């Protein structure tokens, strides 16, 4: 009972970690570069 | 039982901390610089 329960929720946490962690690195870095293209967008409006 | 349960939820909280903390630093700083590009946007409307 506790064996397959705990192993099951262990793998559940495993998809939780792959999911959340990937969301972290991706969303953080890519949103940072979105702020980058946005800075360059405002500079583009300046050149306009 | 309590061993793999508590270790399991410890790593669960670990992804919770990486997730939420990264959300903090990123969203705060990047949204701050969004207020920056927004100030410069209003100044751009002034120059217009």
XYZ file of N, CA and C in Angstrom:
288
model
N 0.840 -1.191 0.000
C 0.000 0.000 0.000
C 0.877 1.243 0.000
N 1.596 1.465 1.102
C 2.459 2.636 1.186
C 3.556 2.599 0.131
N 3.954 1.404 -0.303
C 4.980 1.244 -1.326
C 4.564 1.924 -2.625
N 3.521 1.400 -3.277
C 3.098 1.965 -4.555
C 2.457 3.339 -4.399
N 1.857 3.633 -3.242
C 1.381 4.995 -3.001
C 2.545 5.975 -3.045
N 3.584 5.708 -2.251
C 4.685 6.656 -2.130
C 5.519 6.711 -3.401
N 5.733 5.572 -4.062
C 6.419 5.608 -5.350
C 5.605 6.384 -6.376
N 4.285 6.190 -6.367
C 3.411 6.904 -7.291
C 3.515 8.409 -7.089
N 3.382 8.868 -5.845
C 3.467 10.301 -5.610
C 4.893 10.817 -5.742
N 5.888 9.934 -5.669
C 7.256 10.345 -5.960
C 7.393 10.681 -7.437
N 6.922 9.792 -8.314
C 6.967 10.121 -9.734
C 6.073 11.311 -10.055
N 4.957 11.448 -9.336
C 4.120 12.635 -9.473
C 4.929 13.895 -9.198
N 5.664 13.911 -8.083
C 6.541 15.042 -7.820
C 7.602 15.166 -8.899
N 7.954 14.058 -9.556
C 8.973 14.129 -10.594
C 8.471 14.930 -11.788
N 7.250 14.647 -12.247
C 6.695 15.493 -13.298
C 6.469 16.910 -12.794
N 6.164 17.065 -11.502
C 6.061 18.406 -10.936
C 7.384 19.156 -11.041
N 8.506 18.465 -10.827
C 9.797 19.144 -10.842
C 10.243 19.454 -12.262
N 10.098 18.496 -13.179
C 10.416 18.782 -14.573
C 9.566 19.936 -15.089
N 8.258 19.871 -14.839
C 7.323 20.913 -15.238
C 7.729 22.266 -14.671
N 7.637 22.414 -13.348
C 7.885 23.710 -12.724
C 9.275 24.242 -13.052
N 10.303 23.392 -12.974
C 11.672 23.849 -13.226
C 11.821 24.344 -14.661
N 11.326 23.565 -15.626
C 11.379 24.004 -17.017
C 10.657 25.335 -17.191
N 9.468 25.456 -16.592
C 8.749 26.725 -16.587
C 9.624 27.849 -16.050
N 10.379 27.573 -14.985
C 11.285 28.549 -14.392
C 12.273 29.008 -15.447
N 13.213 28.132 -15.813
C 14.310 28.551 -16.684
C 13.787 29.214 -17.954
N 12.859 28.541 -18.635
C 12.308 29.066 -19.879
C 11.661 30.431 -19.673
N 10.615 30.496 -18.843
C 9.877 31.748 -18.679
C 10.781 32.888 -18.214
N 11.681 32.619 -17.265
C 12.579 33.659 -16.774
C 13.471 34.186 -17.893
N 14.246 33.296 -18.520
C 15.221 33.738 -19.517
C 14.534 34.369 -20.725
N 13.501 33.704 -21.243
C 12.826 34.176 -22.445
C 12.062 35.465 -22.182
N 11.470 35.599 -20.993
C 10.832 36.861 -20.636
C 11.861 37.968 -20.463
N 13.063 37.618 -20.004
C 14.151 38.588 -19.942
C 14.478 39.105 -21.335
N 14.649 38.188 -22.288
C 14.886 38.591 -23.667
C 13.685 39.309 -24.274
N 12.482 39.084 -23.738
C 11.328 39.873 -24.155
C 11.453 41.311 -23.669
N 11.937 41.498 -22.442
C 12.272 42.846 -22.005
C 13.378 43.439 -22.869
N 14.263 42.595 -23.409
C 15.309 43.092 -24.301
C 14.722 43.615 -25.611
N 13.969 42.768 -26.331
C 13.308 43.240 -27.545
C 12.395 44.417 -27.260
N 11.929 44.558 -26.019
C 11.056 45.675 -25.683
C 11.850 46.961 -25.506
N 13.016 46.875 -24.863
C 13.931 48.009 -24.835
C 14.266 48.450 -26.251
N 14.625 47.493 -27.108
C 14.934 47.820 -28.493
C 13.708 48.318 -29.247
N 12.510 47.937 -28.800
C 11.283 48.490 -29.362
C 11.128 49.959 -28.998
N 11.401 50.306 -27.740
C 11.312 51.698 -27.323
C 12.374 52.544 -28.014
N 13.584 52.001 -28.165
C 14.616 52.694 -28.933
C 14.181 52.842 -30.384
N 13.470 51.841 -30.911
C 12.930 51.953 -32.261
C 11.927 53.094 -32.358
N 11.062 53.236 -31.349
C 10.148 54.372 -31.315
C 10.902 55.690 -31.192
N 12.055 55.682 -30.520
C 12.888 56.878 -30.458
C 13.409 57.248 -31.841
N 13.930 56.261 -32.573
C 14.428 56.527 -33.918
C 13.301 56.952 -34.850
N 12.090 56.434 -34.627
C 10.921 56.957 -35.325
C 10.657 58.406 -34.944
N 7.652 4.880 5.336
C 6.460 5.643 4.989
C 6.732 7.133 5.148
N 6.918 7.574 6.394
C 7.181 8.987 6.638
C 8.477 9.434 5.977
N 9.418 8.511 5.787
C 10.691 8.806 5.141
C 10.469 9.330 3.727
N 9.959 8.475 2.837
C 9.767 8.887 1.450
C 8.644 9.906 1.298
N 7.657 9.905 2.198
C 6.656 10.971 2.171
C 7.318 12.325 2.401
N 8.070 12.449 3.496
C 8.627 13.745 3.867
C 9.745 14.174 2.928
N 10.592 13.239 2.491
C 11.594 13.589 1.488
C 10.923 14.005 0.186
N 9.854 13.298 -0.183
C 9.122 13.619 -1.399
C 8.582 15.041 -1.356
N 7.900 15.393 -0.267
C 7.343 16.732 -0.154
C 8.421 17.777 0.110
N 9.601 17.357 0.567
C 10.725 18.281 0.689
C 11.209 18.704 -0.689
N 11.412 17.740 -1.590
C 11.774 18.130 -2.947
C 10.639 18.886 -3.623
N 9.390 18.528 -3.308
C 8.251 19.290 -3.810
C 8.361 20.757 -3.411
N 8.603 21.020 -2.124
C 8.816 22.395 -1.697
C 10.046 22.990 -2.361
N 11.008 22.153 -2.752
C 12.203 22.683 -3.393
C 11.858 23.286 -4.747
N 11.077 22.563 -5.553
C 10.620 23.171 -6.796
C 9.696 24.349 -6.523
N 8.938 24.298 -5.424
C 8.117 25.447 -5.055
C 8.972 26.682 -4.793
N 10.128 26.508 -4.148
C 10.961 27.656 -3.809
C 11.705 28.179 -5.028
N 12.265 27.283 -5.841
C 12.894 27.734 -7.076
C 11.889 28.477 -7.947
N 10.706 27.889 -8.125
C 9.628 28.492 -8.899
C 9.259 29.867 -8.366
N 8.678 29.908 -7.166
C 8.177 31.167 -6.624
C 9.277 32.220 -6.522
N 10.463 31.841 -6.039
C 11.549 32.811 -5.879
C 11.954 33.393 -7.231
N 12.146 32.527 -8.230
C 12.471 33.019 -9.565
C 11.382 33.950 -10.084
N 10.115 33.559 -9.908
C 8.998 34.431 -10.257
C 9.132 35.790 -9.588
N 9.526 35.802 -8.315
C 9.729 37.037 -7.569
C 10.765 37.877 -8.294
N 12.029 37.445 -8.257
C 13.111 38.282 -8.773
C 12.825 38.751 -10.195
N 12.504 37.805 -11.080
C 12.233 38.129 -12.475
C 11.080 39.118 -12.607
N 9.884 38.725 -12.158
C 8.706 39.572 -12.342
C 8.900 40.957 -11.728
N 9.489 41.028 -10.531
C 9.716 42.317 -9.884
C 10.644 43.195 -10.717
N 11.856 42.710 -11.000
C 12.834 43.547 -11.694
C 12.362 43.904 -13.102
N 11.876 42.909 -13.843
C 11.477 43.128 -15.227
C 10.241 44.011 -15.316
N 9.304 43.853 -14.380
C 8.157 44.752 -14.338
C 8.573 46.161 -13.935
N 9.603 46.281 -13.096
C 10.145 47.592 -12.760
C 10.687 48.279 -14.005
N 11.512 47.568 -14.773
C 12.003 48.118 -16.029
C 10.880 48.322 -17.038
N 9.761 47.610 -16.882
C 8.586 47.903 -17.695
C 7.997 49.252 -17.313
N 7.974 49.559 -16.017
C 7.619 50.912 -15.612
C 8.626 51.924 -16.144
N 9.885 51.514 -16.323
C 10.881 52.419 -16.895
C 10.569 52.734 -18.357
N 10.451 51.696 -19.200
C 10.053 51.926 -20.586
C 8.719 52.645 -20.675
N 7.884 52.540 -19.642
C 6.597 53.222 -19.666
C 6.752 54.706 -19.361
N 7.606 55.045 -18.394
C 7.965 56.441 -18.172
C 8.533 57.052 -19.443
N 9.489 56.362 -20.066
C 10.072 56.857 -21.305
C 9.062 56.865 -22.444
N 8.031 56.024 -22.362
C 6.933 56.078 -23.320
C 6.124 57.354 -23.144
N 5.842 57.725 -21.894
C 5.110 58.958 -21.635
C 5.932 60.174 -22.045
N 7.242 60.140 -21.786
C 8.120 61.204 -22.264
C 8.124 61.237 -23.786
N 8.039 60.065 -24.418
C 7.940 60.014 -25.873
C 6.664 60.685 -26.361
N 5.543 60.443 -25.677
C 4.306 61.135 -26.021
C 4.421 62.635 -25.788
N 5.213 63.047 -24.795
C 5.463 64.470 -24.586
C 6.227 65.068 -25.762
N 7.287 64.389 -26.202
C 8.055 64.882 -27.339
C 7.218 64.882 -28.612
N 6.296 63.923 -28.737
C 5.305 63.979 -29.805
C 4.393 65.187 -29.646
